[PDB]
Amino acid sequence: NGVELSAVGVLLPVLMDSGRRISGGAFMAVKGDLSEHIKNPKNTRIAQTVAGGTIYGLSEMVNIDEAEKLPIKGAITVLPVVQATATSILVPDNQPQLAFNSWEAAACAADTLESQQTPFLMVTGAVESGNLSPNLLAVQKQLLVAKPAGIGLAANSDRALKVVTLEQLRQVVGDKPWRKPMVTFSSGKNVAQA
Ligand SMILES: [Cl-]
């Protein structure tokens, strides 16, 4: 069970531990307030940012202080997705708890996305003072999410499409046409580490 929504935003890879195997999935930092589609009662924390923005879909396992320093001016909801196209997503009813801060580069890029289409590119990394932090898990996100889904990944890492500043990330998400109609991802019920 899930809901298909018209939506524009920026995809981000997540990893999930089921004690035996690490698997991969995706969330999207979606533009707008979509908090009515949050179905995990742990992901019920909201971050209001210094720039006037509001981010929904967060849990206690996210560093909220770092989320509140993001240069996001509008509403962003981070939702799990099992399918995405240029203009829609499919949000599963079974939703994992979102943890950590690697969704921030996508949420910043989704906030200043002016194109009206989601870029065909996934983005990972935490944001601190207009820069992407150094990356830890791009290689594992490549292996478990982006490469099997057939889509590029941007990260502060030379094993991704490399971006260091929020300004560079904005340029890179601006022109990413869809090389196929849809990407799909596995879902999990286990904590999603973004
Ligand atoms: Cl370099």
**Tokens describing residue 54:** 């509001």
Distance (Å) from CA 157 to ligand 1 centroid: 8
Q: Could you tell me how far CA 26 lies from the centroid of its own chain?
A: 7
> What residues pair up with 27 in beta bridges, in sequence order?
12, 80
Q: Which two tokens stand for residue 41?
A: 């009662």
Q: Give how many domains the chain has, as a whole number.
A: 1
CA of 160 to the centre of ligand 1 (A): 11
3-state secondary structure the chain: CEEEEECCEEEEEEEEEECCEEEEEEEEEEECCCHHHCCCCCCCEEEECCCCCEEEEECCCCCHHHHCCCCCCCEEEEEEECEECCCEEEEECCCCCEECCCCHHHHHHHHCCCCCCCCCCEECCCEECCEECCCCCHHHHHHHHHHHHCCCEEECCCCCEECCEHHHHHHHHCCCCCCCCCEECCCCCCCEEC
Q: How far is the CA of 162 from the centre of ligand 1 (A)?
A: 8
Does 102 qualify as catalytic in the annotation?
yes
Partners of residue 76 on adjacent β-strands: 31, 55
Find the domain containing 52 and state its range. Answer: 1-194
**Distance, CA of 11 to CA of 8 (rounded, Å):** 10
Report the CATH number that the domain containing residue 140 is assigned in CATH: 3.30.230.110
To one decimal place, what's the resolution in Å? Answer: 2.1
Residue at token pair 């939703």: 95
What is the CA(176)–ligand 1 centre distance, in A?
Answer: 21
Q: How was this structure determined?
A: X-ray
Tell me the angle at which helices 166-173 and 104-111 cross, rounded to the nearest 10 degrees: 60
Catalytic residue among 31, 59, 141, 157: 141
Tokens of 27: 């969330």
Q: Catalytic one among 59, 102, 157, 187?
A: 102
Backbone dihedral region for residue 52 (phi beyond 0: left; psi -120 to 50: alpha; all else: beta): left
* Distance in Å, CA 158 to ligand 1 centroid: 7
